[PDB]
Amino acid sequence: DFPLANLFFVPSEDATAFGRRLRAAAQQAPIVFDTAFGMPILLRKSHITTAYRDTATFSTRMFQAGILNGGLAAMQGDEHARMRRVYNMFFLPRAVSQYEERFVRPISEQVVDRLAGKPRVDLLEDFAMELPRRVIGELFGFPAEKLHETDERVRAMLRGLVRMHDPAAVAESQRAYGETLGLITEVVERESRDTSDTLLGEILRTLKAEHMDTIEASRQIVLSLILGGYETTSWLVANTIHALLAHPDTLARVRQDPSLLPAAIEEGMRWCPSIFGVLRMVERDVRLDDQALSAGTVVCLAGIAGNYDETAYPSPEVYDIDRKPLPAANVFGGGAHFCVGAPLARMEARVGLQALLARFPGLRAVPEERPSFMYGAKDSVAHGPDKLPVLLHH
Numbered sequence: 589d590f591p592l593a594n595l596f597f598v599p600s601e602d603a604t605a606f607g608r609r610l611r612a613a614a615q616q617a618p619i620v621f622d623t624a625f626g627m628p629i630l631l632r633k634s635h636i637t638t639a640y641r642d643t644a645t646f647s648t649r650m651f652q653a654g655i656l657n658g659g660l661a662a663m664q665g666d667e668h669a670r671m672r673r674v675y676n677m678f679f680l681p682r683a684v685s686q687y688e689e690r691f692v693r694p695i696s697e698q699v700v701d702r703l704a705g706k707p708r709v710d711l712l713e714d715f716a717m718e719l720p721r722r723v724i725g726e727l728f729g730f731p732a733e734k735l736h737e738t739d740e741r742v743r744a745m746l747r748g749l750v751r752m753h754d755p756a757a758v759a760e761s762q763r764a765y766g767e768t769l770g771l772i773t774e775v776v777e778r779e780s781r782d783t784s785d786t787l788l789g790e791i792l793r794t795l796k797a798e799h800m801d802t803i804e805a806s807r808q809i810v811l812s813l814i815l816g817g818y819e820t821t822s823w824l825v826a827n828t829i830h831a832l833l834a835h836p837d838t839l840a841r842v843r844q845d846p847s848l849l850p851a852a853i854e855e856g857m858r859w860c861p862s863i864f865g866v867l868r869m870v871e872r873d874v875r876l877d878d879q880a881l882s883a884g885t886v887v888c889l890a891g892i893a894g895n896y897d898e899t900a901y902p903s904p905e906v907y908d909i910d911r912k913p914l915p916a917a918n919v920f921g922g923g924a925h926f927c928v929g930a931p932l933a934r935m936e937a938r939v940g941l942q943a944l945l946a947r948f949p950g951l952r953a954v955p956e957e958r959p960s961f962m963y964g965a966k967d968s969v970a971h972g973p974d975k976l977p978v979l980l981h982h
């Protein structure tokens with residue numbers, strides 16, 4: 589029914605190639621069948637907006653088939669709303685700013701410290717991944733190093749959530765989750781005791797108060813903070829750094845005026861998104877204009893296909909932090925499932941980049957070796973760089 593295409597697993601040293609490829613496809617067809625994901629990809633903005641809104645027709649029930657079953661993302665309707673309110677409490681604005689003061693800022697300074705005394709580093713492994721890892725460590729009360737040991741299992745878990753029709757990816761996802769459950773069980777057990785003094789402890793306490801603290805619910809809260817809070821957040825920071833490093837005049841301006849960091853992050857999400865969109869399951873035969881989707885089909889909403897719509901964002905290939913209005917983020921999903929941790933991720937990007945920019949006025953990309961970009965970078969489910977080598981000193 590749909591044209592076939594390979595939208596995602598395509599390397600380039602041009603960070604805009606991904607955004608431009610999706611926009612190009614959207615001009616050819618509203619829906620394409622991706623040969624690597626093995627599912628229809630919705631590219632048309634009105635179709636995506638409809639899909640996000642009509643949750644009875646476009647559900648997240650595909651997540652009942654894999655490792656997210658039992659967690660928030662797999663829930664629908666009232667069960668979802670009820671668990672969502674619980675999660676919501678911990679990402680309210682005041683809670684976020686409490687995290688910023690009490691640990692994101694000190695951790696950021698510590699991470700930057702470890703970069704001192706070296707002439708060159710890779711800001712991907714040594715910053716973008718380090719900072720979110722240590723934040724989750726703080727929320728768990730467990731050493732960041734412990735999470736670092738899970739990197740490969742974490743990425744294996746995520747790959748199967750996207751390519752959920754691929755038996756090898758799904759099996760490795762399930763197996764990786766099994767190989768991480770000892771860890772997850774240890775963390776849950778510790779912070780579920782009355783002696784817990786961690787944010788995770790407070791969350792488990794809240795689930796307990798609502799009589800929702802089943803083994804699976806508690807494990808899924810930890811799983812989401814790892815998959816989202818650590819791995820997925822890393823790529824947002826990485827892409828924001830690449831955008832600044834690639835545009836040294838904008839980087840200098842941001843260093844001179846760190847109040848611009850929110851605009852740098854948002855434009856970065858338009859210009860170099862780390863995620864394409866979301867998955868939904870079609871619950872009933874539906875037609876979207878001339879396109880028909882059959883009940884039971886799993887689809888991807890590629891909300892980022894509009895990031896490079898020139899009629900919406902002129903000169904879309906230009907990383908312009910001064911755009912008015914600032915682009916609406918498409919990397920957090922939509923509808924009732926819109927990412928609940930996004931406020932934490934956005935704050936970490938700002939607070940970490942501030943600490944970095946202030947400490948190294950000489951910060952610049954190593955002008956030799958260029959980052960290579962693709963969806964699937966480093967075996968992730970992100971579009972991001974393979975490395976971000978910089979020079980820190982003049």
Ligand code: HEM
Pocket residue numbers: 648660661662672675812813816817818820821822824862863865866867919920921922923924925926927928929930932933
């Ligand atoms: C740059 C960082 C992040 C990005 C781009 C991101 C992206 C996403 C996306 C695309 C979804 C699917 C939404 C949908 O189906 O509409 C999602 C959901 C979710 N994420 Fe985030 N994530 C990030 C960080 C985080 C963090 C830090 C946490 C935990 C603190 C988190 C926890 C969750 C949860 C629990 C869901 C399920 C929400 C629901 O179904 O209602 N994520 N995220």
Ligand SMILES: CC(=O)[C@H]1CC[C@H]2[C@@H]3CCC4=CC(=O)CC[C@]4(C)[C@H]3CC[C@]12C
Pocket residue numbers: 656659660661746749750811812813815816817820863864865866867969
């Ligand atoms: C529910 C949950 O833990 C969240 C936190 C991290 C999220 C994911 C983050 C990565 C992401 C990229 C996509 O394109 C599909 C949705 C996914 C695969 C998200 C699904 C749900 C996740 C796994």
